[PDB]
Design an enzyme around this catalytic site. Structure first.
Site: not given
Ligand SMILES: Cc1cc2nc3c(=O)[nH]c(=O)nc-3n(C[C@H](O)[C@H](O)[C@H](O)COP(=O)(O)O)c2cc1C
Ligand SMILES: O=C(O)c1ccc2cc(CCc3c(C(=O)O)[nH]c(=O)[nH]c3=O)ccc2c1
Ligand SMILES: Cc1cc2nc3c(=O)[nH]c(=O)nc-3n(C[C@H](O)[C@H](O)[C@H](O)COP(=O)(O)O)c2cc1C
Ligand SMILES: O=C(O)c1ccc2cc(CCc3c(C(=O)O)[nH]c(=O)[nH]c3=O)ccc2c1
Lengths: 313, 313
Positions: A70, A131, A250, A44
């Site tokens: 998240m 980010c 994706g 993560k």
């Molecule tokens: C619940 C959740 C949490 C995610 N957290 C991150 C993350 O911490 N870092 C990140 O690079 N992408 C994060 N993503 C994005 C996924 O890595 C991915 O790029 C995106 O969901 C698209 O792939 P998918 O269509 O298979 O869902 C998150 C997605 C979901 C659904």
């Molecule tokens: O509402 C906020 O304050 C807040 C703060 C920190 C954040 C950091 C991220 C990057 C991580 C991430 C997230 C996530 O952790 O929300 N979800 C994704 O689909 N892709 C990601 O890369 C994505 C969103 C974030 C949103």
């Protein structure tokens, strides 16, 4: 017929792995990913300090995909560094560690301390550039000057091959600019396309309400919604970064979807939403499905068709 | 119970219309849309001179939506201006004319000619702020200084209320910047959110080929893939532009989807892919479906729920 790959000086049984964020936050989740049939796993996205993330509900899934805000909940860098240095069994499969500091200085601090572990144990860094940075400015990878700064500072601090996780782009001029920035950095050896499609809004008709609590219901989209966007980005970067690998992410639900990613240029294929919904059994299914399409077509290895999407006339 | 509404000093039988580009290129198409049950119609975006557009195949549709690189084929501004001035029957429904000149000068030249037809006949202008790729530059609505230029010059040259067709955005900072630009211009009285999601890529697994010929298979996405994007943009602009109307476009196949767009803020609801696939019969179905959902919920008017999407906590 085989799904084996050798890249980044590692050996992978197959191209499949989780997407960062899914099934990878706790020790339990990392042990589960490790026990699964995936060819690799990624931890993560972490920050220097642990975070609780945003209020729930913050993820919801539907037939065509998912939405999330998240807010980067994670156990903190020291946890994931310890998992990489002491707990992961590298004889099972390779590990990627994703970092997502909220400033360039936070990322530098982490990669400094990850370097020796990467060198010794072979954990691979995925730097998340989809980010937040300063609120009110665009996310890092939509701010090309910030992106450049991040890559310069992390390249200097880390000093070892790494990869980057990119948001999708939608404009050719952005594909061109983004790839040009990445190609400035020889240590960026892989580019993972794509993170979620930003700031979508799912509304439930019966309740007349958004489905996630943060950000007035706005969140990143994954799953079936985003597959052609993902493919586009994979191929755009595959064409523009000929000295780098592209990992696809994706919209993968099936071996067919993985085959499309690979035809577009993908080396590894990451699974987010579908894995969240189905659980780690998905990886045996995806393997079987991809091998069956290869058998029908007469392909013996992934290299025989990676990046070989045909264009018309 | 009927769906009639008044906007922009015009009366509309219902909030539905075609999306620009769909069923609106030729005199035959405009007459077909005029004969339909839609509340309004919009012409194909035009340029000063006729254009043949890109090589075929340039549109394809699938269960989840469509991909297109039409290349702005159109009969040229003089044809649409003559349709608006001499051929359209305004007693049937309002008409919108979409213009998509390839520079600011070209847009200024067309809008100078449209103004007196607007005054006389009440045709409404939709200015498309998407454009052909130009290497080294983004689409106009993705270049905020360029967008401000266009809007300044059109506002001066045209001098009457008009609307703007916007591509989707994916970042809240971009929502904030874009909406600030728009709110500089009092004559911009409606914002249509969204155009297609740019530069997607559909690949056919059997053939291992992209499915449209232009742009190595890259093209704008519509239909089911884009509904949550479309809703996000509708609501983001609805929140940010309180003195404007928002028109929703993207992913409407049913009265339930229209309902969601209205809940997000939409005044009119445009139909692209679904209309291309089902034909003009779709408008009776959408009306019926939207009235059914309203009856089940006890809503007598669109005003009772427009923009009333609920957030959590
Ligand atoms: C619940 C959740 C949490 C995610 N957290 C991150 C993350 O911490 N870092 C990140 O690079 N992408 C994060 N993503 C994005 C996924 O890595 C991915 O790029 C995106 O969901 C698209 O792939 P998918 O269509 O298979 O869902 C998150 C997605 C979901 C659904
Ligand atoms: O509402 C906020 O304050 C807040 C703060 C920190 C954040 C950091 C991220 C990057 C991580 C991430 C997230 C996530 O952790 O929300 N979800 C994704 O689909 N892709 C990601 O890369 C994505 C969103 C974030 C949103
Ligand atoms: C074949 C086709 C041609 C279109 N041409 C135009 C156009 O000329 N001007 C424009 O503003 N949008 C154009 N679009 C975009 C549509 O108006 C609409 O914004 C997009 O398809 C998303 O709506 P949908 O999900 O209902 O298809 C076109 C779309 C398609 C599929
Ligand atoms: O490929 C080209 O060289 C080229 C040239 C001119 C172009 C003009 C437009 C704007 C019209 C348009 C089109 C279209 O006409 O292709 N399709 C959409 O989904 N939305 C639109 O707004 C869209 C694409 C264009 C592409």
């Amino acid at each position: 017929m085989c799904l084996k790959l050798n890249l980044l000086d590692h050996v992978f049984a197959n191209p499949f792995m989780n997407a960062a964020g899914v099934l990878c936050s706790t020790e339990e989740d990392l042990r589960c990913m490790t026990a699964s049939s995936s060819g690799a796993l990624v931890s993560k996205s972490c920050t220097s300090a642990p975070r609780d993330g945003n209020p729930e509900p913050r993820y919801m899934a539907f037939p065509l995909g998912s939405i999330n805000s998240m807010g980067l909940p994670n156990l903190g860098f020291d946890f994931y560094l310890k998992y990489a240095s002491d707990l992961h069994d590298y004889s099972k499969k390779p590990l990627f560690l994703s970092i997502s500091g909220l400033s360039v200085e936070e990322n530098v601090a982490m990669v400094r301390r990850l370097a020796p572990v990467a060198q010794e144990k072979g954990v691979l860094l995925e730097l998340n550039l989809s980010c937040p940075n300063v609120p009110g400015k665009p996310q890092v990878a939509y701010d090309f000057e910030a992106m450049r700064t991040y890559l310069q500072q992390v390249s200097l601090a880390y000093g070892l091959p790494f990869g980057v996780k990119m948001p999708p782009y939608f404009d050719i001029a952005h594909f061109d600019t983004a790839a040009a920035v990445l190609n400035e950095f020889p240590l960026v050896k892989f580019v993972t396309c794509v993170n979620s499609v930003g700031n979508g809004l799912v509304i439930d008709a019966e309740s007349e309400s958004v489905v996630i609590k943060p950000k007035q219901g706005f969140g990143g989209l994954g799953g079936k919604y985003i597959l052609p966007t993902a493919l586009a980005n994979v191929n755009a970067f595959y064409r523009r970064c000929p000295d780098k690998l592209v990992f696809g992410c994706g919209g993968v639900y099936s071996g067919e979807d993985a085959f499309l990613h690979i035809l577009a240029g993908a080396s590894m294929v990451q699974v987010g939403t579908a894995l969240q919904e189905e659980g780690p059994g998905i990886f045996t299914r995806l393997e079987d499905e991809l091998l069956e399409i290869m058998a029908r077509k007469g392909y013996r290895t992934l290299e025989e068709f990676r990046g070989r999407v045909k264009t018309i006339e």
